[PDB]
């Protein structure tokens, strides 16, 4: 789901020239906007504690 | 004189006229970024070069390719101000036209079957503002230029510090912009050895064999051949005369010396000679000899010749034998020796050995080895000796061809090897690595281009991969390009690069110095620890290019430099400095910009050289420099002259008066701390200056400079409207210029940025005139500090060391009070338990703390808040919390139980008191806006409506005035025009076609004057109304801006411009200050003991000059107060401006009466004086100035002690010095902690004032405590103060209950160490 969201975001940013908004992404995916936000909040890799 | 400078003319004490004005200070950034962005038809600079370097992208099979057409930059979504407010990067979209030609498989390759053209979005490129800054993530950043090693070939040596003996070992290094490094070095055994990419070393003949060179060819290239035939049954050497100049010489008619000059006998000239057989025994062969009958190789190339070999050649019938030349001084057998040690015999074996060196532990194949070599150096995809690198390479080896090639080749490598051999032999010299002709300046444009090319290669691999596959029937080229890698590359460069630095915004000088900074660090540069003495030193080539004074004092000494005043970067990136041509013995005003390599040849005199009326030199033997060495040279031998006296010093060093009387060590500090000054409430000009302040103030961009001349129509504290002159109007323009001023805006260092108007309604202004003075600016002059009365005496130890004693009046008049704007943020997010809400219903908080909050829960604008006051009230849902039995009993007794939400609200930091001046509310799209959000939205919409209406009203007034004038071309009574109501003009009726067509188009244009302005206002409504793109999980952000007035107090750091810094020790009363005979007390008393030891005398001179300046001002004030005639004032002003033999001719005859009165009014607080660096005011001029002001010529007055009234036994130097308030305030440095937060792993107190952390008791402190014998104090610090979790709690309880005793335990750090060592599979255990 995250990978397909990234692919659709890439295609939409290519199409319109700016970053897609959550509502437009939800419309294109035929999925609820709340689910889109939930997916967008979990795509983070933990940051290292040794980073300067 | 310009209008802004005619208001206050600064007296110039210089004597040398200037032939070249100081150029724009921010050219190094603006020119580079213009090179990056502006389209290049030749395709050599900027984005075009990267596009043509990456494109066209060809598929592996050949089915299709993607090629470049053109690029363009779109319109920005937001301007600079909205980008800063919102917190987004100021950038422009990049749109590239790409076409995807499809080839035909059936047709022969190269047939264009189809063409598909589309514009592709390739990311957003950040934009440089007009002042040379970038707005990244809402903050202002500066990209520092880099001083890096220039690409090419450098010849160097170990200086005999590696081998046991001296044995100076020579190496040559070929370093490209991109690709592998090639190293050719010598060994202690005199063998040429080769390294690639700094790995294991091989004989240099391998690189020669891999190019298809036979050993005979190598010997022919690298050696000279001497021939030996057999003539008339005798040995026959072909004699070369230059060689001869241990045996008996032939040519009996001209016998030379036998076994014991040359030219005299060589004069006749013979071509024959006979040598003994032994002369051949020691030589080595040159070519391979083959016998057809035997079919074998009698002697090989590069073999020792023996008697048996000579006999075999004799029997073979061969008569001609050639051998290589070998000496011990001029020619060496190095190549023969490295051929001997080398085991390679063919190209294939050389490739195999190179492959083993490159890729060890891998089976070697011919195709693999061949590929590796071709790619390492002869591939344009992996090797690039750029234009600068190629130019340096060709200059190094003296090659006059292949100027456009960026790949090494046969000729290049062999020329490098030959030149290294020659350098070893003695012909030639090594290169200087610190020489500025070998170091290059790399600016924003080049770095941005490189990162864009990295992104383009990332997208080019995927584009190639997709092109390989053949389903391109319904595929458009915008479906092949992914702009995310390119955007990632540029964003990484502009936000995470070491050279993309947070802007220094204390004052305009800090801005200018940061924009003109060069760093030897950064990617592709040095490191702080690995840098040596040599690179940190001042080179003779730094004259006029790098400032030898301005550099950080510390680990970064010598690694961060500042551009000189007149320094410039040429097209190749090398620093160049201007010079005046000397033609026919006279100094012509023509300026030639010379680089170090061009500077070395010529002899350049200095600006201090005396000149005659005819333009020639006065004294026969002038001082000059040649090849970096100073000396005395004849007048006729001088080729160039310096253009200015401040050519070698940077701007900050050029702003220090009397710099020539100060040491370099203290001038360094003066220049450094001139960038740390904090602007005050009232900007005051320096009484003693250098004349460069105007340049810095104008070029920094903090001031509002008029774009077009005219008459100021309207002035207000936040807006200036200027009526443009009739000669500077674009046809069909409004005719007005609007300047909106920045009012109380936070800077990067939490200072105040404020622009104050300096013009009145009706004042004429020209182009370049200053309309509003920014921070630290006074009437267009840089004003970093204040002029303070200074007495150089000790005062009861309150100026001990570097301490400063300051009078109370300084505090009373707020001379050093500063406004600091601080930004605080409250982020309400979404949690698992619920969503954080901003509201005024804060549990466990009384109505006293809710007084300053509104219904929405946000503090009012203008509310005076102290530490602990609630600014934004936020409540977060909290989970079930377990209660102790006593808490349960308390809740049962008093039924108060309201813990549904927890108070985590934004509170003012402790010891911070200020006024809320701005509140910004950001709400996510789809979240209900609270009442405060709609209030701010309505205020913004009203502001936009009013601003647009007013701007349109003024511009339409100007344009209708133009209309009026077009009618006045004939001239009539517009009273009849006003007889009909203004709107009713559109209700008129005309029947004549001539009049009616006019009316038609006029109506069609008036109604169209509404559509465009409505479009502009609708765009503004879109910008304010729309939601904000916040981080995931963030619901609402409330930002509160606090303005804090910080007054001077003990502990604050105050300093001058001569490196004399100090800390204020006491705020003494006015009655305790020393006072003169007139009763005027001094405001600051400084210790004299700090002048002689640090040898900064320029302050004392400044002090004297300041006194004289103020004295003259006082006289002017008296003349104004006594209402004397204007003739006497004019006479006095002319007398003041005619002192000394100066280059300045300020005559007052053409100054009007009002101009004279304005000038006198601006000279009330003292006459400004300019003393240029190295061209300053002599002591005689200062004494004459003092005598004009009726002051002692020694600058010393008789002072009286305010506490006793007794005159001091000696006169005291009393004057006026320009003092600054540095950004080191005791308010931000005082910290204290008893107990607070602790580290997660080590269970130790955190570090820093922001985290309420504790001080570090390091190893040295432990050593000191052990030396004292203080065991118990050390145990206290180690255990019960840092990491004994039970011990520190027990200590706190014991202190609360009076028993000052401790029960030390085991530090948690030792337990962590134990667990770590056990995790390393090692049993560590505490025996009992």
From TrEMBL, chain A:
Region annotation (Sigma-70 factor domain-3) ranges: 1-52
Domain of life: Bacteria
Signal peptide region: none
Subcellular locations according to the entry: Cytoplasm
Function recorded in the entry: Sigma factors are initiation factors that promote the attachment of RNA polymerase to specific initiation sites and are then released. This sigma factor is the primary sigma factor during exponential growth.
Family under the similarity heading: Belongs to the sigma-70 factor family. RpoD/SigA subfamily.
Quaternary structure (record): Interacts transiently with the RNA polymerase catalytic core.
Name of protein: RNA polymerase sigma factor RpoD
Source organism per UniProt: Vibrio cholerae serotype O1 (strain ATCC 39541 / Classical Ogawa 395 / O395)
Gene encoding the protein: rpoD
First-to-last residue of the parent protein present: 467 to 518 of 621
């Amino acid at each position: 789901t995250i990978n397909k969201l990234n692919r659709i975001s890439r295609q939409m940013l290519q199409e319109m020239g700016r970053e897609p908004l959550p509502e437009e992404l939800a419309e294109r995916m035929q999925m609820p906007e709340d689910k889109i936000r939930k997916v967008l909040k979990i795509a983070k890799e933990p940051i290292s504690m040794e980073t300067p | 004189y310009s209008y802004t400078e005619k208001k206050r003319i600064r007296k110039d004490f210089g004597t040398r006229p200037q032939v070249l004005d100081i150029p724009y200070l921010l050219s190094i950034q603006l020119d580079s970024f213009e090179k990056f962005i502006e389209q290049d038809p030749e395709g050599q600079y900027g984005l075009e070069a990267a596009f043509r370097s990456v494109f066209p992208i060809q598929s592996y099979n050949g089915n299709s390719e993607l090629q470049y057409v053109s690029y363009r930059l779109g319109e920005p979504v937001f301007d600079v101000k909205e980008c800063q407010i919102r917190g987004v990067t100021y950038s422009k979209p990049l749109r590239v036209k790409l076409r995807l030609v499809i080839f035909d498989k059936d047709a022969p390759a190269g047939t264009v079957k189809d063409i598909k053209e589309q514009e592709v979005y390739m990311g957003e490129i950040p934009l440089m503002t007009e002042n040379g800054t970038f707005v990244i993530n809402g903050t202002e950043r500066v990209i520092v230029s880099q001083l890096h090693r220039s690409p090419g070939v450098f010849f160097d040596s170990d200086k005999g510090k590696t081998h046991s003996s001296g044995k100076v070992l020579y190496n040559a290094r070929i370093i490209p912009y991109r690709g592998s490094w090639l190293d050719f070095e010598f060994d202690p055994k005199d063998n040429l050895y080769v390294r690639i990419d700094r790995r294991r070393k091989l004989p240099a003949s391998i690189i020669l064999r891999v190019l298809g060179k036979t050993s005979a060819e190598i010997l022919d290239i690298f050696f000279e051949k001497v021939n030996f035939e057999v003539k008339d049954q005798t040995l026959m050497m072909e004699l070369v005369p230059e060689r001869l100049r241990t045996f008996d010489i032939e040519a009996d008619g001209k016998v030379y010396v036998e076994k014991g000059h040359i030219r005299q006998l060589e004069k006749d000239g013979v071509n024959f000679i006979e040598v003994p057989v032994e002369y051949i025994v020691g030589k080595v062969s040159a070519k391979d000899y083959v016998n057809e009958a035997t079919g074998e190789l009698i002697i090989t190339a590069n073999q020792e010749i023996s008697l048996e070999a000579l006999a075999n050649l004799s029997q073979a019938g061969y008569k001609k034998l050639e051998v290589l030349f070998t000496n011990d001084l001029d020619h060496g057998p190095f190549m023969s020796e490295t051929l001997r040690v080398d085991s390679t015999t063919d190209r294939i074996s050389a490739l195999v050995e190179i492959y083993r060196m490159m890729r060890p532990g891998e089976p070697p194949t011919k195709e693999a080895a061949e590929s590796l070599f071709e790619s390492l150096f002869f591939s344009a995809e992996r090797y690039d000796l750029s234009t600068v690198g190629r130019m340096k390479f060709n200059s190094s080896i003296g090659r006059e061809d292949a100027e456009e090639q960026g790949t090494l080749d046969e000729v290049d490598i062999i020329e490098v090897m030959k030149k290294l051999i020659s350098i070893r032999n003695g012909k030639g010299e090594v290169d200087d690595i610190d020489h500025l002709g070998n170091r290059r300046i790399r600016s924003v444009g080049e770095m941005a281009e490189n990162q864009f090319r990295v992104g383009l290669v990332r997208v080019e691999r995927a584009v190639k991969e997709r092109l390989s596959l053949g389903d391109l029937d319904n595929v458009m080229p915008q479906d092949l390009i992914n702009a995310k890698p390119i955007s990632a590359a540029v964003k990484e460069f502009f936000g995470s690069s070491q050279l993309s630095q947070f802007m220094d915004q204390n004052n305009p000088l800090s801005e200018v110095t940061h924009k003109r900074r060069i760093s030897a660090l950064g990617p592709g540069g040095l490191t702080r620890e690995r840098a040596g003495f040599e690179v940190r030193d001042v080179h003779v080539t730094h004259y006029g290019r790098l400032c030898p004074i301005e550099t950080p004092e510390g680990p970064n000494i010598g690694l961060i430099n500042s551009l000189s005043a007149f320094a410039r970067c040429n097209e190749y990136g090398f620093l160049e400095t201007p010079y005046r041509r000397v033609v026919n013995g006279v100094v012509t005003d023509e300026v030639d910009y010379l680089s170090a390599i061009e500077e070395g040849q010529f002899v350049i005199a200095q600006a201090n050289a005396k000149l005659t009326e005819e333009g020639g030199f006065a004294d026969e033997l002038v001082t000059a420099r040649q090849k970096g060495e100073s000396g005395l040279h004849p007048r006729e031998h001088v080729d160039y002259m310096d253009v200015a006296t401040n050519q070698v010093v940077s701007i900050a060093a050029s702003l220090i008066p009397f710099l020539e009387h100060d040491d370099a060590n203290r001038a360094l500090m003066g220049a450094n701390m001139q960038r740390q000054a904090v602007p005050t409430l009232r900007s005051e000009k320096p009484l003693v200056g250098t004349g460069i302040e105007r340049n810095v103030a104008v070029d920094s961009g903090v001031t509002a400079v008029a774009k077009r001349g005219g008459v100021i129509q309207s002035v207000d504290a936040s807006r200036i409207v200027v009526k443009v002159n009739e000669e500077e109007l674009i046809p069909g323009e409004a005719g007005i210029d609007i300047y909106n001023l920045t009012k109380y805006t936070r800077s990067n260092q939490n200072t105040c940025i404020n622009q104050r108007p300096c013009v009145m309604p009706g004042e004429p202004v020209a182009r370049g005139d200053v309309l509003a003075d920014g921070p630290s600016t006074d009437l267009g002059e840089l004003a970093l500090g204040q002029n303070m009365r200074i007495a150089f005496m000790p005062w009861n130890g309150y100026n001990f060391e570097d301490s400063i004693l300051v009078s109370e009046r300084v505090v009373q008049d707020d001379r050093f009070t500063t406004i600091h704007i601080q930004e605080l943020s409250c982020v309400a997010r979404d949690t698992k338990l619920g969503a954080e809400e901003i509201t005024a219903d804060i549990p466990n908080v009384g109505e006293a703390a809710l007084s300053k909050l509104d219904e929405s829960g946000i503090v009012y604008i203008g509310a005076e808040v102290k530490g602990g006051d609630i600014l934004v009230g936020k409540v977060t849902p909290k989970g079930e919390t377990q209660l102790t039995p006593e808490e349960k009993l308390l809740r049962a007794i008093f039924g108060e139980k309201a813990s549904d939400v927890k108070d985590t609200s934004l509170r003012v930091p402790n010891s911070v008191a200020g006024t809320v001046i701005d509140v910004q509310v950001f709400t996510r799209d789809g979240v209900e806006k609270d009442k405060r959000a709609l209030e701010i939205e309505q205020m913004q919409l009203k502001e936009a409506k009013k601003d647009l209406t007013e701007e349109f009203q003024i511009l339409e007034g100007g344009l209708l005035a133009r209309v009026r004038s077009v009618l006045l071309a004939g001239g009539y009574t517009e009273a009849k025009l006003s007889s009909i109501e203004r709107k009713k003009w559109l209700e008129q009726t005309l029947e004549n076609e001539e009049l009616q067509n006019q009316l038609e188009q006029l109506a069609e244009q008036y109604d169209e004057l509404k559509a465009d302005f409505d479009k502009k206002f609708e765009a503004k409504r879109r910008k304010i109304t729309q939601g904000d793109d916040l981080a995931p999980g963030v619901l609402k952000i409330v930002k509160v801006y606090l303005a804090v007035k910080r007054r001077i107090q003990p502990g604050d750091k105050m300093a001058g411009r001569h490196g004399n810094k100090g800390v204020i020790s006491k705020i003494n009363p006015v009655e305790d200050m020393p006072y003169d005979e007139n009763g005027q007390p001094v405001d600051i008393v400084l210790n004299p003991l700090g002048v002689p030891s640090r040898m900064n005398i320029g302050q004392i001179l400044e002090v004297h000059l300041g006194l004289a300046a103020k004295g003259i001002g006082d006289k002017i004030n008296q003349m104004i107060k006594e209402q004397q005639e204007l003739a006497k004032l004019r006479e006095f002003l002319q007398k003041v401006y005619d002192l000394g033999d100066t280059r300045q001719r300020v005559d007052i005859s053409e100054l009007s009466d009002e101009d004279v009165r304005t000038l006198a009014h601006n000279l009330r607080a003292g006459l400004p004086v300019a003393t240029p660096v190295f061209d300053g005011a002599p002591e005689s001029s200062i004494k004459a100035m003092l005598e004009l002001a009726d002051l002692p010529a020694s600058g010393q007055l008789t002072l009286f002690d305010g506490r006793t009234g007794d005159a001091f036994e000696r006169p005291v130097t009393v004057g006026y010095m320009y003092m600054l308030k540095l950004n080191h305030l005791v308010d931000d440095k005082m910290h204290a902690r008893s107990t607070g937060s602790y580290s997660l792993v080590t269970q130790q107190p955190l570090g820093g004032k922001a985290q309420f952390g504790g001080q570090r008791f390091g190893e040295m402190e432990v050593w000191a405590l052990e030396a004292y014998g203080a065991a118990y104090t050390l145990q206290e610090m180690l255990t019960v103060k840092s990491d004994d979790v039970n011990g520190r709690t027990k200590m706190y309880k014991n202190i609360v209950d009076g028993n000052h005793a401790m029960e030390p335990g085991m530090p948690e750090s030792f337990n962590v160490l134990l667990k770590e060592i056990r995790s390393l599979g090692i049993n560590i255990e505490l025996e009992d």
